[PDB]
Amino acid sequence: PLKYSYINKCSRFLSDDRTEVPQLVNANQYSPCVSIVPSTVWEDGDYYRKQLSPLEGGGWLVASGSTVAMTEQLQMGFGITVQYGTDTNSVCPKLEFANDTKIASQLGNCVEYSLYGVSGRGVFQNCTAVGVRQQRFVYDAYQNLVG
Amino acid sequence: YVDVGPDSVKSACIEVDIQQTFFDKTWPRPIDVSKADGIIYPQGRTYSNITITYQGLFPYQGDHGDMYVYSAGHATGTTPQKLFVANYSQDVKQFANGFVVRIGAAANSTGTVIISPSTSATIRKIYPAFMLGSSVGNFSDGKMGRFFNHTLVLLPDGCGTLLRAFYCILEPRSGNHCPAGNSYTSFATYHTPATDCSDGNYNRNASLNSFKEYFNLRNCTFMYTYNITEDEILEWFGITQTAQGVHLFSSRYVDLYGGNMFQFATLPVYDTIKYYSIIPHSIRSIQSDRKAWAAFYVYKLQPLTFLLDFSVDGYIRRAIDCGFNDLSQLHCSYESFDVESGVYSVSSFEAKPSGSVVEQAEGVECDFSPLLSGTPPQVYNFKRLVFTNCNYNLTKLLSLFSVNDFTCSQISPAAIASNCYSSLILDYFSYPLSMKSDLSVSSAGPISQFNYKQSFSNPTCLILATVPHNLTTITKPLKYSYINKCSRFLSDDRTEVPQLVNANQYSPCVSIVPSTVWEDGDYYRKQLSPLEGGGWLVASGSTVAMTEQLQMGFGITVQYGTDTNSVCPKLEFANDTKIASQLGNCVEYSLYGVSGRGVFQNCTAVGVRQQRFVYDAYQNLVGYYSDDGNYYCLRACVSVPVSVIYDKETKTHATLFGSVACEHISSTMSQYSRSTRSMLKRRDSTYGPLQTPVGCVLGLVNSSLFVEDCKLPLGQSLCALPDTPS
Amino acid sequence: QVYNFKRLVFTNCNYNLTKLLSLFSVNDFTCSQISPAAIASNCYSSLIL
Ligand SMILES: *[C@@H]1O[C@H](CO)[C@@H](O[C@@H]2O[C@H](CO)[C@@H](O)[C@H](O)[C@H]2NC(C)=O)[C@H](O)[C@H]1NC(C)=O
Ligand SMILES: *[C@@H]1O[C@H](CO)[C@@H](O[C@@H]2O[C@H](CO)[C@@H](O)[C@H](O)[C@H]2NC(C)=O)[C@H](O)[C@H]1NC(C)=O
Ligand SMILES: *[C@@H]1O[C@H](CO)[C@@H](O[C@@H]2O[C@H](CO)[C@@H](O)[C@H](O)[C@H]2NC(C)=O)[C@H](O)[C@H]1NC(C)=O
Ligand SMILES: *[C@@H]1O[C@H](CO)[C@@H](O)[C@H](O)[C@H]1NC(C)=O
Ligand SMILES: *[C@@H]1O[C@H](CO)[C@@H](O)[C@H](O)[C@H]1NC(C)=O
Ligand SMILES: *[C@@H]1O[C@H](CO)[C@@H](O)[C@H](O)[C@H]1NC(C)=O
Ligand SMILES: *[C@@H]1O[C@H](CO)[C@@H](O)[C@H](O)[C@H]1NC(C)=O
Ligand SMILES: *[C@@H]1O[C@H](CO)[C@@H](O)[C@H](O)[C@H]1NC(C)=O
Numbered sequence: 056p057l058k059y060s061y062i063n064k065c066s067r068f069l070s071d072d073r074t075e076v077p078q079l080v081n082a083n084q085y086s087p088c089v090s091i092v093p094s095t096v097w098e099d100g101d102y103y104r105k106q107l108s109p110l111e112g113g114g115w116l117v118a119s120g121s122t123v124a125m126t127e128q129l130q131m132g133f134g135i136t137v138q139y140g141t142d143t144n145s146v147c148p149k150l151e152f153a154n155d156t157k158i159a160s161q162l163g164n165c166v167e168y169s170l171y172g173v174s175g176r177g178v179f180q181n182c183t184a185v186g187v188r189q190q191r192f193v194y195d196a197y198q199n200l201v202g
Numbered sequence: 203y204v205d206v207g208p209d210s211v212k213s214a215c216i217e218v219d220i221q222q223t224f225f226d227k228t229w230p231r232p233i234d235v236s237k238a239d240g241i242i243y244p245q246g247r248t249y250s251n252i253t254i255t256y257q258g259l260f261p262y263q264g265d266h267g268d269m270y271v272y273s274a275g276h277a278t279g280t281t282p283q284k285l286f287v288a289n290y291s292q293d294v295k296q297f298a299n300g301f302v303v304r305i306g307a308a309a310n311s312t313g314t315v316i317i318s319p320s321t322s323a324t325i326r327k328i329y330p331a332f333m334l335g336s337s338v339g340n341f342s343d344g345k346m347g348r349f350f351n352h353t354l355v356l357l358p359d360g361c362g363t364l365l366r367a368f369y370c371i372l373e374p375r376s377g378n379h380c381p382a383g384n385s386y387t388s389f390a391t392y393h394t395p396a397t398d399c400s401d402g403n404y405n406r407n408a409s410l411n412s413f414k415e416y417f418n419l420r421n422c423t424f425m426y427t428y429n430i431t432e433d434e435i436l437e438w439f440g441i442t443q444t445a446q447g448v449h450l451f452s453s454r455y456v457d458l459y460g461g462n463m464f465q466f467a468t469l470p471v472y473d474t475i476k477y478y479s480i481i482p483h484s485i486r487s488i489q490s491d492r493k494a495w496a497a498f499y500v501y502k503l504q505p506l507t508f509l510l511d512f513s514v515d516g517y518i519r520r521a522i523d524c525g526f527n528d529l530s531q532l533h534c535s536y537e538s539f540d541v542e543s544g545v546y547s548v549s550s551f552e553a554k555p556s557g558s559v560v561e562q563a564e565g566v567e568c569d570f571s572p573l574l575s576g577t578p579p580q581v582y583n584f585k586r587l588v589f590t591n592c593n594y595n596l597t598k599l600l601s602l603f604s605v606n607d608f609t610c611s612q613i614s615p616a617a618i619a620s621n622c623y624s625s626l627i628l629d630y631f632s633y634p635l636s637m638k639s640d641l642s643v644s645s646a647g648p649i650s651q652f653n654y655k656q657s658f659s660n661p662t663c664l665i666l667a668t669v670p671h672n673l674t675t676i677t678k679p680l681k682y683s684y685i686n687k688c689s690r691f692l693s694d695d696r697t698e699v700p701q702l703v704n705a706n707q708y709s710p711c712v713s714i715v716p717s718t719v720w721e722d723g724d725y726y727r728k729q730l731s732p733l734e735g736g737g738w739l740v741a742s743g744s745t746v747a748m749t750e751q752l753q754m755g756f757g758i759t760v761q762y763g764t765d766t767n768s769v770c771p772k773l774e775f776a777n778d779t780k781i782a783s784q785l786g787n788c789v790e791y792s793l794y795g796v797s798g799r800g801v802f803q804n805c806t807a808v809g810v811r812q813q814r815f816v817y818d819a820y821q822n823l824v825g826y827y828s829d830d831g832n833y834y835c836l837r838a839c840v841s842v843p844v845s846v847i848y849d850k851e852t853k854t855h856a857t858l859f860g861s862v863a864c865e866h867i868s869s870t871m872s873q874y875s876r877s878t879r880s881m882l883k884r885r886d887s888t889y890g891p892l893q894t895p896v897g898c899v900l901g902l903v904n905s906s907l908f909v910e911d912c913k914l915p916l917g918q919s920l921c922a923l924p925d926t927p928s
Numbered sequence: 929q930v931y932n933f934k935r936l937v938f939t940n941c942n943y944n945l946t947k948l949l950s951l952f953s954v955n956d957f958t959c960s961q962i963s964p965a966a967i968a969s970n971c972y973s974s975l976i977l
């Protein structure tokens with residue numbers, strides 16, 4: 056980027072032009088003020104305003120931003136999060152299964168396991184097939200895997 | 203970007219006539235929660251026949267939904283004419299934690315054409331279209347629902363066997379009857395069955411192209427398609443949004459028969475949805491070829507708790523909305539669909555609150571002129587202003603400076619501005635912003651070690667700010683200065699006693715330190731008096747360069763009280779229209795900034811007079827003196843206890859309101875308990891309330907029978923008989 | 929820019945994040961509710977960056 060930049064203001068002016076209320080960003084979501092802010096901030100302290108319609112509840116959207124000088128090598132940041140699902144846990148590290156043994160039946164002992172990233176320890180048995188298909192995991196009222 | 207295919211052959215569109223009065227119908231469809239209608243299956247797990255409670259987004263049991271019906275447009279004779287559609291294009295709704303819909307439930311039945319209802323045509327399922335996005339606004343003709351940026355588009359295309367979805371930018375068209383044209387009425391889409399959906403060649407692009415005739419796609423970033431096959435059976439569908447993106451659900455893929463939702467698909471879009479609307483559509487079919495279509499419905503979702511009856515086959519078959527009734531509350535508490543017969547307690551009524559009155563005031567604007575001129579103090583020299591009896595508007599003060607640091611411990615900053623107090627105290631000082639890293643109310647920096655501290659017994663706030671170029675009556679210190687040490691030497695010349703500053707007090711070392719520190723690292727000493735046991739006062743300090751604009755800080759604390767609360771925000775009492783002496787049964791109130799709710803009564807005037815309020819041994823307000831010379835007593839307000847008689851043998855119930863008596867009873871309650879009490883009304887809509895010696899009851903019937911044991915005694919001699927066995 | 933975020937999500941897939949990490953020089957790596965090593969070895973319904 057020409058300069059690194061960010062929004063340092065995002066609030067709505069009350070229609071009576073005195074009172075004002077801030078609009079803090081929602082976790083994991085874009086702030087609403089992005090609708091008026093330019094893709095980069097052209098100059099430090101740049102600001103913009105939008106009149107708001109009675110459909111919008113009135114007032115003026117107000118926003119501003121600030122900048123930081125560019126560098127010879129780009130500097131970057133990342134955010135990383137993960138989500139644990141139940142039958143959707145298909146994201147994994149590449150498998151190390153090569154040069155091992157056939158799985159998973161042993162029957163056998165109550166062997167440690169992971170299925171689609173769901174860890175546990177236990178023994179398996181030939182069973183019927185209660186409800187319901189394609190949910191993969193089955194649980195009791197006590198939050199213990201049943202099968 | 204996405205290969206949506208070619209732009210429309212013309213910018214022109216078919217004219218749209220609004221025929222909405224033809225479409226007004228009353229065909230409500232309340233949710234059969236007992237049938238698990240509209241239930242979304244839990245994510246990723248399944249169960250045996252055990253019943254478990256669960257929490258998630260769900261429809262309300264009593265919701266009748268919103269109804270929309272698609273219909274044929276105008277055609278006459280053997281050919282198509284102009285569209286005749288509903289005004290649904292104007293129905294913008296806020297997104298509200300998703301929704302679910304009912305599609306085709308009226309299949310294999312007959313109804314009417316609606317636009318030409320005399321035909322009495324048989325009805326068949328038709329699939330809905332929608333648009334979602336973060337903003338809406340006026341069309342250049344002032345029409346409702348124009349959209350901004352990119353929006354979700356969901357449309358069946360041609361026959362229902364194909365479903366499409368997109369994320370793209372719409373563009374208005376200047377053709378006649380189109381959004382940038384000035385002949386525009388309202389947007390609509392259409393299908394033309396005469397050639398569309400040929401049996402050997404279904405027209406997969408039919409609906410998209412009619413959409414394209416009113417808008418030009420730009421920047422399409424996503425597209426999806428899905429495979430569907432025809433089946434007139436009812437299907438459920440819905441939408442939710444999470445930080446993982448939008449999710450789509452349907453009953454068709456897994457539980458076509460039972461209707462349980464499953465997550466059929468997901469979407470990559472992470473833009474938050476703020477608005478939702480239904481896309482209007484019409485059939486271009488020939489006037490003798492018209493076909494009526496089955497009704498379509500929509501239902502809102504909310505994060506409600508439900509009992510769920512899983513089938514041994516893993517389908518949810520029954521569910522209980524816990525908040526639907528007091529009866530439902532009982533089932534949820536016992537985690538079952540069969541509570542043992544008995545009398546049971548249920549939650550009480552809130553007793554019907556009403557609008558506020560206040561007895562605050564009075565006073566004059568708090569003079570804040572000491573801050574408007576001269577040089578502010580060094581960190582150990584603080585100025586203080588005590589404010590009592592006066593009115594304020596702190597935002598007026600905020601306009602005078604640029605604030606570079608705002609923080610408030612133990613109180614929101616909005617509240618401290620709006621709160622009324624026994625006192626308001628402001629400390630103010632010069633402060634370079636180079637030192638702002640060392641200052642917070644909890645900071646370990648030398649500024650707080652030796653120059654200033656605040657008590658935490660009272661809520662506090664802090665402000666750092668600088669002077670605007672038009673505030674030059676305020677002036678700069680030669681240098682900013684601070685004490686970076688304060689201790690006293692012991693008289694024996696081997697040890698030293700540190701002296702951290704006390705909260706809300708000047709450091710003792712100020713008595714020797716100069717009004718400014720002449721040089722960085724300067725130190726000073728004074729011999730201690732013999733009354734102090736001798737030894738030497740010691741202090742040292744440091745400086746910071748002067749800056750182009752003066753930099754300053756503020757400390758704010760407030761003091762709580764009752765009849766001493768004469769410091770308040772400026773107030774306006776117009777159109778209350780009355781305050782104390784106006785009753786009332788439950789009203790909100792504030793007296794001198796003391797909040798509460800209750801009812802007042804004209805009474806005596808126990809002492810001590812003029813002491814403001816009056817309290818019991820448990821610190822609850824008892825009553826209050828007023829400037830009308832009248833003592834008011836306060837009873838707070840009185841809640842109504844509730845209980846329920848339940849007869850599982852006949853599956854019937856009845857209720858008791860306790861000691862409250864039927865004189866405060868009304869057919870509906872604003873007081874309030876649970877969203878409905880209609881289950882009682884199933885018999886009691888037709889009868890008056892009945893007073894009993896214990897209390898007023900509903901649906902009891904005064905039989906005057908004498909029975910030795912009801913197994914449902916109401917206490918005293920009261921006894922509710924079960925109706926006779928089946 | 930920080931108000932312009934780009935997001936990647938991953939489902940159904942296999943990874944070796946240390947090979948990804950080799951492409952940049954990291955001067956700050958921290959995490960919460962997970963060790964920085966375990967986030968690479970744990971399996972998930974999604975991975976979000
Ligand atoms: C389902 O749960 C019930 C618990 O109530 C188990 O008990 C049987 O339920 C059926 C259906 O109500 C009755 O007809 C039987 O008489 C019940 N058995 C007994 C001993 O009371 C039932 O075993 C469970 N089913 C499965 C497949 O686990
Ligand atoms: C599922 O949908 C896809 C497209 O969304 C279908 O794919 C093509 O469908 C046309 C329609 O006649 C065929 O002529 C093509 O040969 C199909 N392409 C293929 C099979 O690669 C597909 O037919 C649908 N149904 C399925 C997979 O059962
Ligand atoms: C009316 O439509 C319903 C679906 O809306 C039909 O229900 C299906 O009918 C078939 C044919 O007998 C059954 O095998 C299925 O079990 C039914 N349910 C499905 C597919 O979910 C019903 O038969 C139709 N009735 C008439 C008279 O046409
Ligand atoms: C998004 O919408 C806002 C108004 O809703 C508009 O000002 C902004 O330019 C849009 N962003 C685009 C078109 O990239
Ligand atoms: C335009 O938007 C405003 C904002 O609420 C709305 O009240 C009005 O009905 C719309 N149409 C016209 C023609 O002003
Ligand atoms: C037990 O498992 C085998 C395979 O391990 C399977 O073929 C069989 O169907 C199962 N038993 C029953 C009763 O289904
Ligand atoms: C037509 O649109 C209006 C919105 O202006 C809506 O309130 C009304 O319910 C619609 N239907 C009618 C008048 O039948
Ligand atoms: C969208 O189209 C516009 C046309 O002006 C172009 O500037 C932009 O790069 C496109 N964005 C894509 C293809 O993501």
Ligand SMILES: *[C@@H]1O[C@H](CO)[C@@H](O)[C@H](O)[C@H]1NC(C)=O
Binds near residue numbers: 731732733
């Ligand atoms: C004079 O001053 C010091 C204490 O400040 C002490 O030496 C002496 O006792 C004082 N004189 C009298 C009479 O107290």
Ligand SMILES: *[C@@H]1O[C@H](CO)[C@@H](O)[C@H](O)[C@H]1NC(C)=O
Binds near residue numbers: 805806830832
């Ligand atoms: C009611 O209050 C007024 C003063 O506001 C007083 O004159 C009057 O005696 C009071 N009445 C009773 C019954 O206490």
Ligand SMILES: *[C@@H]1O[C@H](CO)[C@@H](O)[C@H](O)[C@H]1NC(C)=O
Binds near residue numbers: 893894904906
């Ligand atoms: C109910 O019936 C008894 C029987 O004598 C009668 O005395 C009483 O007045 C009736 N009504 C009420 C409200 O109890």
